[PDB]
């Protein structure tokens, strides 16, 4: 969805360097401050909040 859009190529190039397998990897990474942000569906992040 971000690869389709015409001006979102910079965030595509940023996110393609650190692609993670599962979402819980990103959860533990932002828990241990390995990341700083994560694009994800809303209600699932509300549930994990």
């Amino acid at each position: 969805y971000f690869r389709r859009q015409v001006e979102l190529s910079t965030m595509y190039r940023h996110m393609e360097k650190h692609n993670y397998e599962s979402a819980a990897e990103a959860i533990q990474a932002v828990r241990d401050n390995k990341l700083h942000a994560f694009i994800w569906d809303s209600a699932v992040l509300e549930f994990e909040a």
Partner: protein
């Protein structure tokens, strides 16, 4: 084993250098019954071809055939395919129609050629188009075969492109031109280059029509493969100046080096198969009155003297030496570009246009544009190190980077550009409709009159 090498009249190749092509060669000869037969022949008709094939196969069981054609008939190699379906002998097509881009081989065939498929040559031409950023392109094809896979490979490349190519539907030529509806298709041209896929006489007819109609301007470039251009010893009439052709027939890496490499591959496969199986000479007895241990699945990864000459599954070379030539005003074909085993080298980095091609020419629509790197306006970064492609909301530029302080030489490094003024110039090119020529200033900052010197 016994290898007979017959030729015609291509590259003015005589016979005595073929007699001298065996003496110092094969010093570590583990096959003992190796003999060479150097022959020449004027007649390139299939009757004499079948006659000499039967004479050499009946001539003490020759297991190697090396032939280079000088004519413009690729079906001779298909004739060799009919020879490969009957003799079942490893045969190599070397020059001309014996090694043109043929359609499809057979699993029952043991024939091979020098060169590659049309898909790797299309990949080289699309790499040229990627390096030169000509995203506005055409595709003009006749009904000459080998076109379905070629156009299909182009469509699967554009449909799976990270570049954003601008493509029109395929211009098709059905029959000999009426100059009523095919003229409309040539007036349905897509700009900035012309890509052509046809035969030799069809190329003569299409270039004659484009010369009579004036489709050879400075914007409409001409990029063709070897199948459109033809053989190198003869150059036909009515050719536009600036005809970029992609072939593999080198004059420096001439025909003698190619047949020496072919003899090296054949002797290498024979010496590698003789140590595995004993009774290597097993051919057909005679043509009158009609094998398992063959080299069909054994000599694929062959390499003699470090030459990248491995075999494909379709019967070609995996990474052959591709030669990209142009045409000047002096009717000469000069080498410009070469192809590495992974990349594509470009000698003439500053791309020439060959301005002496037609009568009238303005220097319109291209405006020399210079700028300086400012962070909210002019963001200049490197190109992608993996794909070599600026993303299509960025524009290319060149910079005259001097190498070191002692030398005065500088290169033209191409870099991607995003920012505010980039979008300003792109919207001006949308509205005012002018093509940009963006580069950077290398003298320094914006500008100052240093004692009546700016």
């Amino acid at each position: 084993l016994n290898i007979a090498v017959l030729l015609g009249h291509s590259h003015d190749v005589t016979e005595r250098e073929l007699r001298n092509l065996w003496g110092p060669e094969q010093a570590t000869g583990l096959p003992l019954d190796v003999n060479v037969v150097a022959l020449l022949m004027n007649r390139t008709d299939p009757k004499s071809l079948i006659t000499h094939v039967c004479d050499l196969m009946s001539g003490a069981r020759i297991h190697g055939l090396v032939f280079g054609d000088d004519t413009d008939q690729e079906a001779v190699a298909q004739m060799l395919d009919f020879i490969s379906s009957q003799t079942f002998i490893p045969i190599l097509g070397i020059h001309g129609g014996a090694s043109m881009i043929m359609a499809d081989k057979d699993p029952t065939s043991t024939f091979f050629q020098f060169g590659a498929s049309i898909q790797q040559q299309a990949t080289v031409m699309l790499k040229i188009m990627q390096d030169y950023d000509w995203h506005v392109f055409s595709l003009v094809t006749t009904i000459f075969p080998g076109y379905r896979d070629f156009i299909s490979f182009i469509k699967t490349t554009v449909d799976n492109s990270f570049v954003g190519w601008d493509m029109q539907n395929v211009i098709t030529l059905d029959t000999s031109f009426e100059d009523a509806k095919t003229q409309v298709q040539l007036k349905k041209i897509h700009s900035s280059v012309i890509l052509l896929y046809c035969s030799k006489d069809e190329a003569v007819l299409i270039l004659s029509e484009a010369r009579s109609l004036g489709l050879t301007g400075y914007d409409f470039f001409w990029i063709v493969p070897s199948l459109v251009s033809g053989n190198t010893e003869l150059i036909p009439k009515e050719f536009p100046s600036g005809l970029i052709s992609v072939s593999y027939d080198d004059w420096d890496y001439s025909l003698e080096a190619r047949v020496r490499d072919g003899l090296g591959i054949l002797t290498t496969a024979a010496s590698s198969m003789l140590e595995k199986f004993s009774y290597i000479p097993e051919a057909k007895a005679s043509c009158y009155g009609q094998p398992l241990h063959t080299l069909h699945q054994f000599m694929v990864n062959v390499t003699w003297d470090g030459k990248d000459l491995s075999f494909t599954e379709e019967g070609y070379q995996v990474h052959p030496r591709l030669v990209v030539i142009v045409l000047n005003k002096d009717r000469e074909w000069e080498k410009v570009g070469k192809w590495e085993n992974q990349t594509l080298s470009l000698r003439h980095a500053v791309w020439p246009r060959y301005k002496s091609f037609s009568d009238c020419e303005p220097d319109d629509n291209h405006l020399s544009i210079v700028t300086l790197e400012e962070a909210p306006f002019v963001i200049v970064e490197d190109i992608d190190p993996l794909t070599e492609t600026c993303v299509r909301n960025t524009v290319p530029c060149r910079k005259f980077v001097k190498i070191n302080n002692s030398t005065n030489e500088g290169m033209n490094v191409k870099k991607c550009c995003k920012g505010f003024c980039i979008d300003i110039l792109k919207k001006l090119s949308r509205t005012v409709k002018f093509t940009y020529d963006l580069y950077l200033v290398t003298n320094g900052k914006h500008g100052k009159k240093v004692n009546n010197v700016w």
